[PDB]
């Protein structure tokens, strides 16, 4: 035991003598390869995503580097990991969402559209023929009977429902900052939530942002469309958090 | 630390000696290897510049590093 | 590696034979150092 | 050890090594630069002549992927011509079913997504080929995308690919370009090429250029002969001086 | 794209063992403890729920699923492989119900779910499943408790444990299980034998219980479990 | 040494070994030259015999009435790629009622030899072509490789000791545009005579000439149709 090799077992996805899948414990290390971090916070009226946006050059256009993707009109999500795998899995989400509406006729819940992204990933675990995708989707969206919701699904399959999560480089550090602001408990208004998200990302990286260094995706119960906030709206919250 | 001769019976300090290095380091002699001339290295003309400017130049024109204000690599 | 950048910027000057550096000298040096820094082996975090 | 024999194997590090290597096969090719202005896109390839026996201006690295979409490639050239046919085939199925020239934002995401499907399995080998899609429309302006082996696409205002990727990205950062007419850019492109090329590492070169913008009415051509000469004269003068 | 491998990865060794199934049983023994106790008018399936912060929402997933109006599952081991088997079971049950217009008997369902898990130790280019299912059901007047292993075998039990510390729990149950219990302990005695392997404080949102009497299988609401957790009920 | 057993693996250096090797199959093949003018394209190939009692293997394969090729590599692969071209030029007569223009033919060979350098356990075709054709753009030569690249040339040579020819052809590349038909073939032979050992010469039993022109559908010459071109040929002194 204790990590031994069964010969092949770090080159395909079969059990080790220990009882683990080394090939999937590696695909998690890809998520941190990206170098970005994304926080997601649930309110009582709205769920917020905030992502670090890193434009390395002056050449790259800044409006086509985004990590926030519209899956439906009532489902956004943020992709962390290898950018190739990411876009490949977003494409696949959109497909399922619109296939759902086509077969059942009432657009898809955020619950199930994760459960299907999760199960496609699971197949890549169980066969030897391919590697698993090296990315990690966090969906948000308002449910018609449970308020807002946040789900995160991993390269192995395991997906769960959250009140606040992160993913990427500072995935440990964030969830220690967040769980303190969750056991206290507030009203969690729309301005409460955006406040908790930006201040978590801003302190765990130490940046203290410019409106052009984050992109903020948000979905309210009053207006269930998934918006991506422009730089004008983002700045209103940053100078409000510099006062307070 | 210093090395010193000592009279082999009555332990008197007789003189101070030049410090000593392991004979394998003196065997790593500063040899005298036959000229070969940078003209007889084919291609690799850039490489020669990159090395000379980093090793050879600070041996005579450290004046040009002091006037600019930097330390050689 | 920032200590390197400031030296490299110096070396272009000594090569061109100026008595001063400029804003390109530090622009080039960051590109050079940054290429070999990435090439020259991956650095891993070792936690305690 | 055995983490490089397959595209289907993460390494302990966290990164697929077969894709890393592919990208290094690009870096060992000649240089191609793209630079988008406000009313067109201009392309520039630094095509080496390896003998005097190859016919002039032939076996290009400038494809037409559609009647308004350039494709300038770098890297292993065989796999390039393969992509240029998958792309033509996509930009035909799109005009068939939706009835109008395919938008370059989408043609890119579809050609990247096809490259990506080749880094997943062990049964295939990831493409050794980075390439830029340019395009002009009057409803979208100029757009310039760049794909790579990974399967990543990114909008750009300029970029370069190949063995002088570093030296050429400098020349474009030191260039205003959100304000220049197409006609003025072509002079810049030629000048940039001449700078980034080494005749002490290569013999000589032929300079390939492509409009696609307001000049030509949303088509994509190769720059006419006369304007190409003017751009070579203005480029020898900036190397003299 | 691809074709797929064709050659089995589970192979005999010089011993006469199928090493892959031996290992996939060690994954099972890393999983969260689960106990099963057939009563004399119901079956109790209780399980140690997984969590490791206060951020998780302990009502968005369920380790106790319903397969049919009269069937239930819990599992011990890899969580992705469990959503695959729960989903091939629910379809098996629906083909059976579509041909005989009759709820699938519980002996039947376990015997088919097992033959899916047997197919992945002799198919091309796959690894066995990483779970043990504990299948309760109440048909034809009786209760039933089965357990299928990633091997493919299955054994009827009168009460058992799986997952972590399933050798301590099978002993603890061996004494405390005296037939003719009422349905309500199997709950009590079940919850106790989770505690013989659980470190911390049990709460209504930290374990999941499911019963299964003549009225049909049902997951116990959080309120309901909080009461059995008087440690006296 | 582990990156040589598939076309599917890249090498840390950023090449592919299985594609490099295949091209050594071409340098084992028998020298062959191709040059053009502005009215004729010519394929001059040095056949070879593997015994004293034996004929020589045909280097020039007739494709259509305006396309020839000259192989160099595995012959079993050369007739697998020749049947596919014969089939591509009977697809064009039959649909468009025109000759398939060479540039668009070499682009199909390019699409079909690319494929098996990227699928598992299939190999590259171990044969290099010289494609002499003449259509509505005058004459062409095209060199094909097992890598799947190709080139438009003005005068190319492949096979063994071909480098000796390539230099002869690169010193005289200016004179080719002004030759009459018989003067061109002289160049080709004089270039092909620099690929032999110094001890033997071009005879009529191991030279093959292929001519395609503006008014002349692609022909092939053997044995005693080659004599009107060796006779008159300069002497090559050492």
UniProtKB/Swiss-Prot annotation, chain A:
Glycans are attached at residue 4. The modification Phosphotyrosine is found at residue 158. The modification N6-acetyllysine is found at residues 101, 103. Its main location: cytoplasm. The keyword DNA repair does not apply. It comes from the Eukaryota. GO terms for cellular component: cilium; cytoplasm; cytosol; extracellular exosome; mitochondrion; myofibril; nuclear matrix; nucleoplasm. NCBIfam families: PRK03996.1. This is Proteasome subunit alpha type-6. It comes from Homo sapiens.
UniProtKB/Swiss-Prot annotation, chain B:
Signal peptide: none annotated. It is found in: Cytoplasm; Nucleus. Sumoylated by UBE2I in response to MEKK1-mediated stimuli. Component of the 26S proteasome, a multiprotein complex involved in the ATP-dependent degradation of ubiquitinated proteins. This complex plays a key role in the maintenance of protein homeostasis by removing misfolded or damaged proteins, which could impair cellular functions, and by removing proteins whose functions are no longer required. Therefore, the proteasome participates in numerous cellular processes, including cell cycle progression, apoptosis, or DNA damage repair. Component of the 19S proteasome regulatory particle complex. The 26S proteasome consists of a 20S core particle (CP) and two 19S regulatory subunits (RP). The regulatory particle is made of a lid composed of 9 subunits, a base containing 6 ATPases including PSMC3 and few additional components. Interacts with PAAF1. (Microbial infection) Interacts with HIV-1 Tat. Belongs to the AAA ATPase family. This is 26S proteasome regulatory subunit 6A. It comes from Homo sapiens (Human). The gene is PSMC3.
Curated annotation (Swiss-Prot), chain C:
Transmembrane segments: none annotated. It is found in: Cytoplasm; Nucleus. It comes from the Eukaryota. Component of the 19S proteasome regulatory particle complex. The 26S proteasome consists of a 20S core particle (CP) and two 19S regulatory subunits (RP). The regulatory particle is made of a lid composed of 9 subunits, a base containing 6 ATPases including PSMC6 and few additional components. Interacts with PAAF1. Belongs to the AAA ATPase family. Component of the 26S proteasome, a multiprotein complex involved in the ATP-dependent degradation of ubiquitinated proteins. This complex plays a key role in the maintenance of protein homeostasis by removing misfolded or damaged proteins, which could impair cellular functions, and by removing proteins whose functions are no longer required. Therefore, the proteasome participates in numerous cellular processes, including cell cycle progression, apoptosis, or DNA damage repair. This is 26S proteasome regulatory subunit 10B. It comes from Homo sapiens. The gene is PSMC6. The chain holds residues 342 to 389 of 389 of the full protein.
Curated annotation (Swiss-Prot), chain D:
Induction: Down-regulated by antioxidants BO-653 and probucol. Up-regulated by bacterial lipopolysaccharides (LPS) and TNF. It holds the Pfam family Proteasome_A_N. InterPro entries: Ntn_hydrolases_N, Proteasome_alpha, Proteasome_alpha-type, Proteasome_asu_N, Proteasome_sua/b. Disulfide bonds: none annotated. The keyword ATP-binding does not apply. One of its GO terms (cellular component) is extracellular exosome. SMART domains: Proteasome_A_N. The modification N6-acetyllysine is found at residues 52, 201, 225. GO terms for biological process: proteasome-mediated ubiquitin-dependent protein catabolic process. Keywords: Acetylation, Cytoplasm, Host-virus interaction, Nucleus, Phosphoprotein, Proteasome. PROSITE patterns: PROTEASOME_ALPHA_1 (PS00388), PROTEASOME_ALPHA_2 (PS51475). The modification Phosphoserine is found at residue 238. One of its GO terms (molecular function) is ubiquitin protein ligase binding. It is found in: Cytoplasm; Nucleus. Belongs to the peptidase T1A family. Component of the 20S core proteasome complex involved in the proteolytic degradation of most intracellular proteins. This complex plays numerous essential roles within the cell by associating with different regulatory particles. Associated with two 19S regulatory particles, forms the 26S proteasome and thus participates in the ATP-dependent degradation of ubiquitinated proteins. This is Proteasome subunit alpha type-3. It comes from Homo sapiens (Human).
